[model samples]
Target: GSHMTPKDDEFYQQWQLKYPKLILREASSVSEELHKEVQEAFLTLHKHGCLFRDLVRIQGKDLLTPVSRILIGNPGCTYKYLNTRLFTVPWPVKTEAEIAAACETFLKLNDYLQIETIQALEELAAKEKVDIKSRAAYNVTLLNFMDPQKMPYLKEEPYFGMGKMAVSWHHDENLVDRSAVAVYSYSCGRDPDIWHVGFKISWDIETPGLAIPLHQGDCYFMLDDLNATHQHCVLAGSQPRFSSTHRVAECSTGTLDYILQRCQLALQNVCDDVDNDDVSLKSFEPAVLKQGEEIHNEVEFEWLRQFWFQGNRYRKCTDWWCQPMAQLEALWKKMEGVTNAVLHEVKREGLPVEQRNEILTAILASLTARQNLRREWHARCQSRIARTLPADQKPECRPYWEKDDASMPLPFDLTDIVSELRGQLLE
Candidate 1:
């Protein structure tokens, strides 16, 4: 008996790859109650739940192989827990729900203020001169929940290595899901969820909502974020709150410098580092599908691909219908350079105090988070495309293909990438 893959199912799914695949993870779940013909609540924003079989890792369950509790928080960007915001979207919970949900004002990070992975991918493609469509992508939202208690066992130093902190929520929808949620497995003897993601958070009282001008529909300034301080437990809610987990396996002296400063104030360290999805997390090839007792494929078959890649609704705003490289490039070139410079600087410096290094580093880190927020937005668009890919179609590969080119040869999963991201800092 082996484990089952959670991809290929129409049910909602999220796969994050922060720090390669180190830190936190999430598993997929499917129940008539959870995903009725009309979704009552789609995956609003989820992280720290992909490494295991739990949907909300903080559901208050003892992990079979519970890892050490860790904590992450910062004024900008230093690797720690999934250092971002958290938010959940509410759907009609009925089959009659439209292909797209009507975003509401109460949605916290409103639609106009978000970005999708496809949009980011298009930008990346244009910069690199590649007509790449953010294949198998998704959209992301900014949710500042700040509930570290959500996943207690994992965050609390008592058991898991995660930490306590304030945070937000983020909703994810694969702009190009390919409906690859209910994948089959052949090792664990059961199917499990798989994915890890990262996003940004803020509290810019000057921004719209509190300050952002709603007149600017879907205006997401993750790059210029002025909210979401990196102080640990700055806003302690009730006891059992679920705080999203974001961590980095690799750390530099520069990063450590920032961490030490926060510790001086007894603040938690939560770095909103993003990009950690990969393969090697699965145990088998996708030649065969395992749904409870049903079996599928592992090779690349057109019809098989249709199941996940041909989802109808998800494709509309996903890679299926994503904007052209020209459109995305224009925007990325304007914002990306400013944003990438910050990330490159942070990675290069490791953790140092050159000139306004502390403040600038924090600002740059926050910029990285904003860019990630944009990526998350595109990821949501991809999800919609993925779900509609297969009205009844199924996939031939396992859930690991999206993140891995070779199922598990050696590229390593996201965790492997992050954990192994260490070397003498650049001068």
Candidate 2:
């Protein structure tokens, strides 16, 4: 079922004619040792839980769906190809040692891929009449983990008979112009002979789609105009697979400034929450305190605490956050002071048990409001980014939901909670 027919071979020949910049290389082109090392590195990262599915709010979808594939990538790099705004690797890597080690491995892998593909890139540059030396460094390396067992949708119809689409069709729009992207494939359990990298021109209806089989340890590069002229996607096999895609990410001054602006806005919201005099000691009665305690125990509230407060640092914190790290830390210290004061008052037993509970409940309510504010700010930032994409460049297959609808429900939407708690305190 996986073998290519003569017609498929003919299609490949025609595809080569149409898309000359796609250069495929067999596993023999790269040493087996390098492949093994890469495989081990990927596994190590996965084992550490650095790779996880991204929460995406797809257009026309209310729920934040987890992307089918688990992913990890270099910090601060943004991929605008996806419909979501603030596209980043969202999970925390946890330890500084692990973060440093992962970064080192990413650089080492990037260097190896660069060395291997330099000749191909140079040749492609010559053909395209572009200066290869001036091209940006490969600052973005994203690893995607796909397994049919984990994602039941991969085993669904259309894909069940034909191969599963590990990635949907799209051009690499967020890359540097005329720059090449190199992909290294690694697989486990079974040799991924059924997996293929499918390619097609977006507007060409007459030409049939062509797929290039990408077996275990194989590598390929799409050079110069190939990314612009043709769309490519992974038609995955039944077994688990990993792909390391290295690209020269386009982080123009405008993009950097935009990200910085968003970071500043988020920080400002944090400051506002901390400084606001709405929630105070007198606001919480015993019943209200019990209600606050119940809210804290709620699954959504716990998730928010884990995601926003528990982590030492975000693994994929955007570059813009570096400038505001000190300010954010200072704000946290102020928050800590306020928390300490509340606890000190409660501990002193200056009031009755009901009053003490009232004080503690007030603290909980304030913290909850702050968390909700942060969540709402993030959603607002994403919605703004989603709407900013230019008209001509939007994907035809699935256009971004441009409406300023940040109305996603709880865990995701805490605006209602923020309002309820703040409204009670204000009254």
lDDT per residue for candidate 2 within 90-149, as digits (tens), equals 233332445445555656777777776677776765776635743425766767777655
Residue lDDT tens for model 1, 341-390: 23343456454545324434234333333334434333432443323444
State every prediction's TM-score relative to the real structure: 0.19, 0.57
Regions more than 4 Å wrong, model 1:
1-99, 102-139, 142-163, 166-235, 239-427
Candidate 1: global Cα-lDDT? 0.23
- Model 2: pairs clashing at backbone N, Cα or C within 3 Å: none
Going through the candidates in order, what is the number of backbone clashes in each?
Answer: 170, 0
C-alpha RMSD by candidate, in order: 24.7, 14.2
Local distance difference test, each candidate:
0.23, 0.52
